[PDB]
Amino acid sequence: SLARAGKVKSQTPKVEKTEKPKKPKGRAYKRLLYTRRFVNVTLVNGKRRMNPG
Amino acid sequence: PRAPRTYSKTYSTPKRPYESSRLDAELKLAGEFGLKNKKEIYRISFQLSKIRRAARDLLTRDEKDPKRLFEGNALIRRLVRVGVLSEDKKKLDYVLALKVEDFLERRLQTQVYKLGLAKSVHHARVLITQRHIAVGKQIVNIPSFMVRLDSEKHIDFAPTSPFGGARPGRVARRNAARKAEASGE
Amino acid sequence: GKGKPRGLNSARKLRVHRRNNRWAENNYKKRLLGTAFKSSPFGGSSHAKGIVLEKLGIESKQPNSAIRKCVRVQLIKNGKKVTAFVPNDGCLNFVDENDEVLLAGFGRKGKAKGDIPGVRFKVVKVSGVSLLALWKEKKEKPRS
Amino acid sequence: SVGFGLVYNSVAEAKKFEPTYRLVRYGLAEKVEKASRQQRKQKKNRDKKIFGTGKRLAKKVARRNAD
Amino acid sequence: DKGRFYAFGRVFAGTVKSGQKVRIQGPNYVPGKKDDLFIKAIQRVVLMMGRFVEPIDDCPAGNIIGLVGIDQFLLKTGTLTTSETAHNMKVMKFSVSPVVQVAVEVKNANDLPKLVEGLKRLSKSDPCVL
Amino acid sequence: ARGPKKHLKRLAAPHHWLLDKLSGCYAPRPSAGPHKLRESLPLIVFLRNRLKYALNGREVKAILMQRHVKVDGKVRTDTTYPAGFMDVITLDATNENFRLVYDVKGRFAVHRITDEEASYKLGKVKKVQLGKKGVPYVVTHDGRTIRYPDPNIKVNDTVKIDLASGKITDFIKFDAGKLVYVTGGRNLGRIGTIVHKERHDGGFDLVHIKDSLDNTFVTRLNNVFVIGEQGKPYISLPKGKGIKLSIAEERDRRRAQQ
RNA sequence: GGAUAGUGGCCUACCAUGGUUUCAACGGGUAACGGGGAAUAAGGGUUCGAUUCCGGAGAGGGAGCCUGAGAAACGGCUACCACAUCCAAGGAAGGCAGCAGGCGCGCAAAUUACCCAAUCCUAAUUCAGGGAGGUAGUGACAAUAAAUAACGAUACAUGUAAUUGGAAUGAGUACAAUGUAAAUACCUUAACGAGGAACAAUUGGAGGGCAAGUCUGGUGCCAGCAGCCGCGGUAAUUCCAGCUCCAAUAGCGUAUAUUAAAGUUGUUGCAGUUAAAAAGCUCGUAGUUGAACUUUGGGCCCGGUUGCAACGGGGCCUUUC
Ligand SMILES: [K+]
Ligand SMILES: [Mg+2]
Ligand SMILES: [Mg+2]
Ligand SMILES: [Mg+2]
Ligand SMILES: [Mg+2]
Ligand SMILES: [Mg+2]
Ligand SMILES: [Mg+2]
Ligand SMILES: [Mg+2]
Ligand SMILES: [Mg+2]
Ligand SMILES: [Mg+2]
Ligand SMILES: [Mg+2]
Ligand SMILES: [Mg+2]
Ligand SMILES: [Mg+2]
Ligand SMILES: [Mg+2]
Ligand SMILES: [Mg+2]
Ligand SMILES: [Mg+2]
Ligand SMILES: [Mg+2]
Ligand SMILES: [Mg+2]
Ligand SMILES: [Mg+2]
Ligand SMILES: [Mg+2]
Ligand SMILES: [Mg+2]
């Protein structure tokens, strides 16, 4: 039935965003990704990984 | 109305968007050559594919054919002039074996770094973009320039753009004007 | 042989046979018959404006649940009545009875998408403002 | 800076052959102050309606509006 | 022309210009936060007279003028401001109210969109109709 | 469509004019005149694009208005006068004379000539007919009619035209071993000698031409222009003399100046 | 014979019964103007082409016609049909599928701007005219280039932590100048114009296809996501959010159509026992296809191209022009 549309979005707590420093856009972002992925930072976990736990 | 204006695309996207090996190779190229995005790699691969198709169509023709000879010689001349094709590989079969890195090396952003004018490819990129590099007597503020193997001995700083000239800059002016007051007088 | 003429002078039969057998393809037959113009309430167009007639709760097909909150809309172009899904969490409050809505296809070239039965269109805008720009707080619906 | 240059054998030849806008730029005979294109075209269209000189029509409307 | 409905009103402060960025404020526009407020521009300032409109380039405060190219943005009334902290003006309360109510339904079910459009245009042509 | 066209859109002009693509919407339409529309060369094109003397069409008109230009002895104040093959452009100011001939690439080359031979012109005899009152005459490639011709002059021959008295001084016949210019087709601008003429009654007559480099090509009779006998041209040939070097040899000649 | 500028059943009089067609006539449909071309394409193909050029047709629908070389012209006329304008009601005037602009229709498309400076065109003609055309305004149609940072010092384990510093620049704004018909914009620059360099990049995703979380809170077959498979019914990697990460990036997503993928239209190049498909069977016209055979083989020369050899031609006889 109707009169239930938006139930979860309505009763979803409004967690506000967390201010962080901006990311460098463009060629600087490509540089940041290249260093994060190909200087062998501690992200391997055996072979390779891209998110923590 | 006036004649149509001809225009062509200079790149081509990959068929498979999310191939991890291709993404890693593209990121390696972008990091090594200080590229802004994947569109520059796409453009280089598109140019390489056009050249490869031309050389293939020429190689299907019989040897000493007039058209094959003329067009292959012209293509080899252009590639060695731009320095992508080495001087010992003027055969039209090593043209087929050209790579993306061969074109990316002749970039002005790569050459400014390899000539010691910059500390990194990204430093060369910002220096070129900020009009600091002159190829001959002409400022070239575009990292993709394809130095012609004779302008390489001429890549230097411009008379303007105060790393190769007289003026002391723009932020140095305000810094001096603030330091004169901060000194006390 | 392979069941088709190979003779150098059999081009007429070959092309006539191909012409006859192309009718078994759905896209070719629909294009040559102009099915989209007569049928397919969107008369060969990507989008169509309409006036919302009723909010309905259409129960999704098995094995699913969660009735989908569609709207019955009368198209301005031809007066045909279609059902349009309102895709977002909520967003049924962003559409009202007797409202103007832009509808697009559901992505499956006229086939019903997902577990929604008999629904081949979705709402893109309502009262002239994007449904996504209403779901996000970027814009607000004009007062009416 | 790369441009074009012309050197006529005389000032009379320069006036005879140089375009009016370039002469006005240099300082020679100035731009002729005509009306806007819309107004000029409207004026010529209005004159297209009247047949003769127009003093006949002026005298004819001298009486009417009124008597 | 059905659906233009020139915006008649008075400028109380400042000068309005043809082609001037202005803020449309709704009759219930809160001036603190965002509400039904538009950032649009005027297309033509108009002098309204005995049924003939004269285009005007600019009009000073305390005068009567019409506006062309606006009012698809405010339903009934409202203020056009250039300040960003400009409270909307008063709601223009009248001694009468809509009290006689009737139901309307088209005989031809097919032109319900026409009925809806006519209702929406009448609800803005008449100030006291609801 | 209701009458003759008077405009010439760009990209519809003959490509041998080498007009700019984006200069404007239109190209100078060759007015009616002696040679043709396609096979012509407007004076505005010759003065603003081939000699660069004038910068605009207004300047071309200014040049033409003061009787400076002269085509075949006459002033020809027409901005788009259809100058064509063998026509003599003479300007009294900047006194040099050009004979409009075809270069090896088929364009109308700028070919300076001298006053002592700009007097005459050559003309291919288009037809030999008996006019009114039994007076024979010849019609030439440039639309000239000449009364009382030599009784031995036939079609496909060439006639030297005084261009001052406008009369025939000499005539060359069409035969094997005569110097011929190619005035149309793929080989437009080539110069060679006649090897053989295949007749093809009803159809089109074909003629084989052999250049000085021994290259032999066949072309339609309609676009061959006898200019003399081998080694003795009656006119001054252009810089390349219609050799049609291959592209490789052209590149070699270009690279021979370093 | 008439008519035409002229051929011609183009029309007329007489005469004959012919002319087209399964090699598809004729009829019907086209959301069909044709082509140069466009997209996609290993090859072969498939789809599109109203639209910058060429040809045709039309100026609301027809029809008729004047002038004129050229019109069945429409910013020429006449009538009818349909619309529709002003009227003092007697009458008179109409044709934006030209340029702007308005209404309507819609998913769907811009200024009632400037100028003849270029391109050309027209005229009695260097001079005048040109919404042809050019210029600018609007414009994320599409296309090209590529800002959003770069480099040091110091601490920790080349990287990291809002531990600091000096440089560089254009995005802008603007003397002037160039550009322009007048400009505007671009280039070139006097001065100004970075530290959160807030001068802050977004669009879609993170189960698989398909690159990226078994993170946390919420909801609990509800709300919703989901192109498809599927997720959600109190342990949600899939919804709603925060963090982090991914992809492309001044672009990204969505809908429709189309192309490749599609060897799922197969000529190349499909399949037909059981997945869809061999006619119940035979005859047979059109069509398609159809056994073998007629100067081969000797030989002597001249001679071109690639490196004395190969490959390419020509001339003679051999019962042979
Ligand atoms: K389920
Ligand atoms: Mg078509
Ligand atoms: Mg049609
Ligand atoms: Mg077309
Ligand atoms: Mg159409
Ligand atoms: Mg056309
Ligand atoms: Mg017509
Ligand atoms: Mg119309
Ligand atoms: Mg007509
Ligand atoms: Mg008209
Ligand atoms: Mg007309
Ligand atoms: Mg128009
Ligand atoms: Mg930014
Ligand atoms: Mg700039
Ligand atoms: Mg999530
Ligand atoms: Mg994965
Ligand atoms: Mg199959
Ligand atoms: Mg079965
Ligand atoms: Mg079966
Ligand atoms: Mg048979
Ligand atoms: Mg046989």
Give the CATH number, domain containing residue F136: 2.40.50.740
Q: What is the C-alpha to C-alpha distance for residues B3 and A24, in angstroms, rounded to an integer?
A: 43
When divided into structural domains, chain B yields a total of 1
Please indicate, yes or no, whether residues F91 and F4 belong to a single structural domain of this protein.
yes
Give the Cα separation of C104 and C108 in Å (integer): 11
Q: Is residue B9 part of a domain?
A: no
The residue range of the domain holding C2 is 1-144
CATH code, domain with E39: 2.40.30.10
CA-to-CA distance for B133 and A8, rounded, in angstroms? Answer: 58
> Which residue from F121, F103, F106 is spatially nearest to F239, judged by alpha carbons?
F103
Report if residue B11 sits inside a domain: no
- Give B71's contacts in chain F (Cβ within 8 Å): none
Query: What are the backbone dihedrals phi and psi of residue E121, each rounded to the nearest 5 degrees, phi first?
Result: -75, -35
Of residues F226, C139, F199, C125, the one with CA closest to residue F209: F226
Instruction: Kindly give the residue spans of alpha helices, DSSP state H, lying in F99-178.
Output: 115-118
Determine, yes or no, domain membership for F58: yes
Strands in C2-144 per DSSP E: 47-56, 70-75, 81-85, 100-105, 121-126, 129-130
- Smallest CA-to-CA distance from B29 within B51, B44, B19, B11 is with B44
Please give the structure tokens belonging to residue C24: 């078994």
- Are the C-beta atoms of residues C83 and C58 closer than 8 Å to each other? yes
F58 to D17: CB separation less than 8 angstroms, yes or no = no
- Taking alpha carbons only, the member of B83, B61, B82 closest to residue B72 is B61
- Report the alpha-carbon distance of residue F104 to residue F188 in Å, rounded: 7
Give the span between the Cα atoms of B90 and F155, in whole angstroms. Answer: 56
- What angle, 0 to 180 degrees and rounded to 10, lies between the N-to-C axes of helices A27-38 and B121-129? 180
Considering the domain boundaries, does residue F54 fall inside one?
A: yes
CA dihedral (E101, E106, E107, E112) in degrees, to 10, reads -160
* Alpha helices, H only, A1-53: 7-10, 27-38
In terms of Cα–Cα distance, which of F89, F119, F91, F115 is closest to F101? F89
Query: How far apart are the C-alpha atoms of F89 and F72, rounded to whole Å?
Result: 7
Nucleotides of G under 7 A from a protein CB: 23-24, 31, 47-48, 52-57, 69-74, 102-108, 113-122, 126-127, 129-134, 142-152, 158-160, 162, 166-170, 178-182, 188-189, 192-193, 196-198, 200-201, 204, 206, 210-215, 217-219, 221-233, 236, 239-250, 254-259, 264-272, 278, 287-290, 306
In residues, how long is chain C?
144
F166 shares its domain with F178:
no
Q: Is C73 exposed, middle or buried, given 0-12, 13-18 or 19+ CB atoms closer than 10 A?
A: buried
Strand partners, B32: none
Q: What angle do CA C131, C132, C137 make, to 5 degrees?
A: 105
DSSP E48: -
Give contacts of B 120-139 with A, CB under 8 A: 122, 125
Q: Which domain holds residue F163?
A: 121-171
Interface check for F58 against chain D (CB to CB < 8 A): the answer is: yes
CA B145, chain centre distance (Å): 4
Q: Which residues contact B150 (CB under 8 A, 6 or more apart)?
A: none
Domain tally for chain C? 1
Q: F104 and F189 in contact (C-beta within 8 Å)?
A: yes
> Which residue in B has a C-alpha nearest to residue A31's C-alpha?
B31
Give the ligand at the shortest distance from the Cα of F1.
Answer: 7
The residues, ordered by sequence, that sit 6+ positions from F223 with a Cβ below 8 Å of its Cβ are F182, F183, F184, F185, F188
Q: What is the DSSP letter of F48?
A: I
Measured in whole angstroms, the distance separating CA C137 from the mean position of its chain's CA atoms is 27
| Domain hosting residue E44, numbered range | 1-92
**Could you tell me which residues come within 8 angstroms of residue F245 by beta carbon, excluding any fewer than 6 positions away?**
F104, F253
Query: Which residues are CB-neighbours of C120 under 8 A, at least 6 positions away?
Result: C82, C83, C105, C106, C108, C110, C111, C112, C113
Q: Are E46 and E68 in contact (CB under 8 A)?
A: yes
* Separation between the CA of B13 and the C1’ of G204 (whole angstroms): 17
The H or E element containing residue F206 is strand F206-210
Amino acid (one-letter) located at F161 = I
Contact partners for chain B, using 3 or more CB pairs closer than 8 A, are: A, F
Contact (CB, 8 A) for C51 and C76: yes
Report how many domains make up chain F: 3
Could you tell me the resolution of this structure in angstroms?
A: 2.0
Q: In whole angstroms, what separates CA B129 from the centre of its chain?
A: 13
DSSP 3-state of E41: strand
The residue of D6, D17, D18, D23 whose CB has the most chain F CBs within 10 angstroms, and thus the best one to mutate to test that interface, is: D17
* B6 domain residue, yes or no: no
Q: Residue F237 is part of a domain; what is its CATH number?
A: 2.30.30.30
Together in a domain, F17 and F94: yes
Residue where one domain finishes, among candidates F145, F171, F197: F171
C95, C56 Cβ separation under 8 angstroms: no
Q: In whole angstroms, give the CA distance from residue C18 to residue C25.
A: 11
| Furthest CA-CA distance within chain B | 83
Tell whether F55 and F140 lie within a shared domain. Answer: no
Number of other CB atoms surrounding residue A7 within 10 Å? 11
Instruction: Reduce the DSSP state of residue C84 to 3 states and report it.
Output: strand
H helices within chain B, ranges in order?
20-33, 38-60, 66-82, 100-105, 108-114, 121-129, 171-182
Burial state string for E41-74 with b = 16 or more CB within 10 A and e = fewer than 16: ebebbbebeeeeeeebeebeeeeebbbbbbbbbb
Sheet holding F158-161, edge to edge: F145-147, F136-140, F121-130, F158-161, F168-172
**Residue pair E92/E24 in contact by the 8 Å Cβ criterion:** no
Question: In angstroms, rounded to a whole number, what is the distance separating the alpha carbons of residues A43 and E83?
Answer: 53
Which residue type, as a one-letter code, is found at position B149?
L
Q: In what order do the strands lie in the sheet with E44-47?
A: E7-11, E63-68, E44-47, E54-56
Domain of F25, CATH number, reads 3.10.290.10
Question: CA neighbours within 13 Å on the CB side: how many for B70?
Answer: 9
Domain membership of residue B86 as a residue range: 17-185
DSSP, collapsed to helix, strand or coil, labels residue C130 as: strand
Domain stop point among F116, F133, F154: F116
Pairing label, strands F136-140, F224-229: unpaired
| SS3 at position F105 | coil
Domain membership flag for residue B7: no
What CA–CA distance (Å, rounded) separates B105 from B127? 17
Q: Are residues F38 and F8 in the same domain?
A: yes
